[PDB]
Design an enzyme around this catalytic site. Structure first.
Site, PDB file in Angstrom:
ATOM      1  N   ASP A  14     -13.194  50.681  13.166  1.00 25.57           N
ATOM      2  CA  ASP A  14     -14.362  51.558  12.997  1.00 25.57           C
ATOM      3  C   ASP A  14     -15.441  51.297  14.080  1.00 25.57           C
ATOM      4  O   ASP A  14     -16.617  51.058  13.747  1.00 25.57           O
ATOM      5  CB  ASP A  14     -14.956  51.393  11.586  1.00 25.57           C
ATOM      6  CG  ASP A  14     -13.917  51.595  10.479  1.00 25.57           C
ATOM      7  OD1 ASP A  14     -13.258  52.666  10.460  1.00 25.57           O
ATOM      8  OD2 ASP A  14     -13.768  50.685   9.618  1.00 25.57           O
ATOM      9  N   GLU A 177     -14.415  62.043   7.020  1.00 20.66           N
ATOM     10  CA  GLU A 177     -15.201  60.802   7.077  1.00 20.66           C
ATOM     11  C   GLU A 177     -15.593  60.478   8.523  1.00 20.66           C
ATOM     12  O   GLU A 177     -15.459  61.326   9.415  1.00 20.66           O
ATOM     13  CB  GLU A 177     -14.432  59.643   6.426  1.00 20.66           C
ATOM     14  CG  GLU A 177     -13.161  59.183   7.163  1.00 20.66           C
ATOM     15  CD  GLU A 177     -12.278  58.257   6.324  1.00 20.66           C
ATOM     16  OE1 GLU A 177     -12.603  57.979   5.146  1.00 20.66           O
ATOM     17  OE2 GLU A 177     -11.238  57.826   6.844  1.00 20.66           O
TER      18      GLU A 177
END
Ligand SMILES: O[C@@H]1[C@@H](O)[C@@H](O)OC[C@H]1O
Ligand SMILES: O[C@@H]1[C@@H](O)[C@@H](O)OC[C@H]1O
Ligand SMILES: [Ca+2]
Ligand SMILES: [Ca+2]
Lengths: 504, 504
Positions: A14, A177
């Site tokens: 991420d 997301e």
């Protein structure tokens, strides 16, 4: 010129990137590991040096009950008028928060909790009109429609101005997301992940004249994915874009390097780099028309690994993480200067709630890891050693232990509901060198008697049984030093003289 | 009206369908299991009854050295002027062959080997001009370009007429495969799988006025996929189309029902059904615009499970398969009428080359499986019992065994390189009832003393450690009856009185 992917190898998922002048900073998710949210610096987007962590204090990082399925999820890093903002989710608490810094060599602020902002992957965007926006996912607790949510935020108060609004459902992939909002060439771009962070992972983009939409889906979505390919890089997505100071555009994102069949990965999700081009009609395309390689052209980026810890300092090196918040009194660099002194508790590597353990990421497929241990177990329950660890149900360890008033070197494995002693040999001194040779398929567990230099292969273990696919959660393998009293406090101290990480 | 997917549950992959009048026949891949290539019949495409197998003789099915990674791969079934043609690959031999039948209640022909036709997924198409075409994948041994290959075939000779030609590379997904050629509404359609038979699986289609192309890719490819979704059905593809006798169009294909996270499946790839509509501009779209559900509308199809084997017949029921070609002399239904008499060899469930074993597919997540065994082990190496089996490195078993002149019921597991005795209890009679309760997460292993009816839970095992993702290969879990002498011939015979499969 060329560079290789991943640019940050091992468990670094991420990635969020932030440009300050000609410097670049990048943050990654850390789940149940303490300290939390590693932070890196680069001047060329290719080479990253770890500068430390963002969450280093109990008040910033509450990891009781955190596992490799929970704790700190995707972090986002932004800069505005001299202040850095780090925004993230503690999924264990189901809470989103921001910490701030004006000096990255110093520590970050106390957290500001954003009450009534659910979901994961919170992100920030500073607009030209003085407005700041928070963007994130649907909130499951509230039965929200799947998609990307947004509001104006008051950063001082840690509260939402006006309404929380669904701004985009994505293209139809699962789990929309990782949203980031940007403004380029008079358009707002909304960049997201879809398909889940596994084999279906992809990056999609939408655009609007307005920060709240309506957003039009890019006609050649998805703009980056290795879905339905056999490429060595898989699960690619969760991108964050940056304009380099020469004017060229680049994305960071993560991906995996799975092995065997079906594909299984154990080095975690790893940070990668790819260029962006903007089409005539105003859309970004990442890499080789939505695909990337292990070898990549560096454009105009200016191009440019053995790690030994002698425990000579009384500050832990930045390689070391603990499982949840450590019990500080059980680790001492001062009791025996130049060694790490560990106090095993009743807790074992099978328990989630901070066993006595310090570990560092496996960052290469081929590597040799070793430590010198002094340990004289006083009782049969007492154990100290070297672990290859994925989570509480997936780990292997070589250790000194005692049985029926006899000292043994053992190879132990936990795989799911199986706990086994694979091999056991009597050992006749107080000190031992443990070593693990890792290759893509197999860990090989040896010990050396320090006084003779004789090595012995005690046994082996499969890499695939520690893989994320097998183990569950969101992380990569760590090599760890640990001690335990297996249901009792460990009365014998464990002393580790050094630790070596030698990758091929 | 409605039906549920899968229409054929458990290990039934790569379905190929063939219409004869108002009857429908369907075949699936079988890998290392004997007999090979199950064949089903339906009158409504929803309900299938197994009529037996296509490969039942050593000459048709050479499985020495076959594993769940090899043996019989995708089969294709076609009908022309009263003759059925079954075409498939024995991947262990790297050879493609055809068998023929004119009576499905009888046995199939000796194989005709197609020399110099490599690749997998061979398929046949009978054209209006008397020509027959064979279609298949690239051949890896010859360094061919990835894609779909085709030639005219002489069915009598088992040889290629004219040239082997690449007809389509697919859309760009990995492993373009499962090709079928059809002719509908004056177009030739080439239907294929891409993305691999895992999370990236999809169906794509191309069309041409000519059987060899050039083929134009369908503009809304892929026409069926669950990639990048969180649907309970995954890995969907390897389709074969049929026009039902009412004129409506339907596809059969496989998919999985994975559980846990990351998704892992243990019931194999399972046969599913979906409708086709043809667009105005001449393209097929499968199901709900390229997606399907567990509950489906039946259109005009005419809508309509406990299995106990008492071993009362001297022909094995069609549920039973062996690992590779069985050693027939080690299985007797005649020695003790109304029982199965098994002779364990030196070979164990850890060995690939036909251990003494008979098994049936797990076809439901929730089920209870049991057997009554008479076994009096004569020596310590001797063992007979009930197994949950995926492959030679992934199986659990509950068994009677002997140790130091003492009879024990044991729970044993093999997971990768781990072999463990999980629990062991002394047992004091010659007969025992073994039972396994399966639920999605866990198998529960019990035994019953037949004389008292008292049950004892011996232990449990995880379903996920037997999953395809973990174990490797291309198959589903079997419940099996086995005997072994663990490196020696087993001197004690094993007698199984019956076997029950009771699904929820
Ligand atoms: O990306 C993740 C998805 O794959 C799921 O399994 O868990 C939550 C999501 O953030
Ligand atoms: O579909 C299969 C693919 O996924 C690969 O792994 O093995 C060969 C192919 O037939
Ligand atoms: Ca030292
Ligand atoms: Ca009977």
């Amino acid at each position: 010129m060329e560079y290789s992917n991943p640019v940050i190898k091992g468990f670094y998922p991420d990635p969020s990137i932030c440009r300050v002048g000609s410097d670049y900073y990048l943050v990654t998710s850390s789940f149940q590991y303490f300290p939390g949210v590693p932070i890196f610096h680069s001047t060329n987007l290719i080479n990253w040096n770890k500068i430390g962590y963002c969450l280093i204090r109990p008040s910033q990082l509450m990891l009781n009950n955190a596992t490799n399925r929970s704790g700190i999820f995707a972090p986002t890093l932004r800069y505005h008028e001299g202040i850095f903002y780090l925004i993230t989710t503690n999924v264990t608490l189901k809470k989103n928060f921001i910490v701030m810094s004006e000096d990255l060599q110093g520590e970050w602020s106390e957290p500001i909790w954003i009450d009534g902002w659910g979901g994961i992957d919170p992100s920030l965007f500073f607009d030209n009109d003085g407005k700041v926006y928070i963007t994130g996912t649907n909130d499951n607790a509230r039965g929200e429609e799947l998609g990307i949510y947004q509001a104006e935020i008051d950063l001082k108060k840690g509260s939402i101005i006006g309404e929380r609004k669904l701004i985009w459902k994505g293209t139809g992939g699962s789990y929309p997301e990782a949203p980031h909002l940007y403004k380029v060439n008079g358009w707002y771009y909304l960049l997201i992940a879809e398909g889940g962070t596994e084999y279906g992972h992809m990056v999609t983009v939408a655009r609007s004249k307005y920060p709240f939409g309506p957003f039009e889906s890019c006609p050649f979505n998805p703009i980056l994915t290795h879905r339905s390919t056999n490429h060595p890089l898989q699960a690619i997505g969760h991108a964050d874009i940056v304009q380099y100071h020469d004017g060229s555009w680049w994305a960071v994102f993560h991906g995996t390097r799975p092995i065997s069949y079906p594909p299984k990965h154990h080095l975690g999700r790893e940070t990668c780099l790819a260029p962006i081009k903007w089409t005539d009609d105003g859309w970004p395309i990442i890499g080789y028309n939505g695909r990337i390689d292990i070898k990549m052209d560096a454009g105009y980026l200016p191009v440019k690994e053995i790690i030994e810890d002698d425990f000579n300092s009384d500050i832990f090196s930045t390689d070391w993480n603990f499982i949840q918040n450590p019990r500080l009194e059980h680790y001492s660099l001062k009791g025996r200067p130049s060694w790490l002194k560990m106090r095993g508790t009743e807790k074992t590597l099978n328990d989630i709630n901070s066993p006595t353990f310090i570990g560092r990421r496996q960052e290469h497929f081929v590597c040799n890891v070793s430590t010198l241990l002094e340990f004289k177990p006083n009782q049969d329950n007492e154990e100290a050693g070297l672990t290859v660890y994925m989570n509480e149900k997936h780990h292997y360890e070589i250790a000194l232990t005692k049985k029926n008033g006899r000292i043994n070197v053992v190879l132990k494995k936990t795989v799911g509901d199986i706990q086994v002693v694979v091999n056991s040999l009597e050992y006749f001194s107080n000190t031992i060198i443990f070593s693990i040779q890792a290759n893509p398929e197999e860990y090989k567990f040896s010990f050396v008697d320090p006084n003779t230099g004789q090595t012995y292969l005690l046994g082996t273990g499969l890499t695939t049984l520690l893989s994320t696919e097998v183990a569950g959660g969101f992380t990569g393998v760590y090599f760890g030093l640990y001690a335990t009293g297996n249901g009792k406090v460990c009365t014998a101290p464990a002393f580790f003289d050094w630790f070596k990480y030698i990758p091929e």
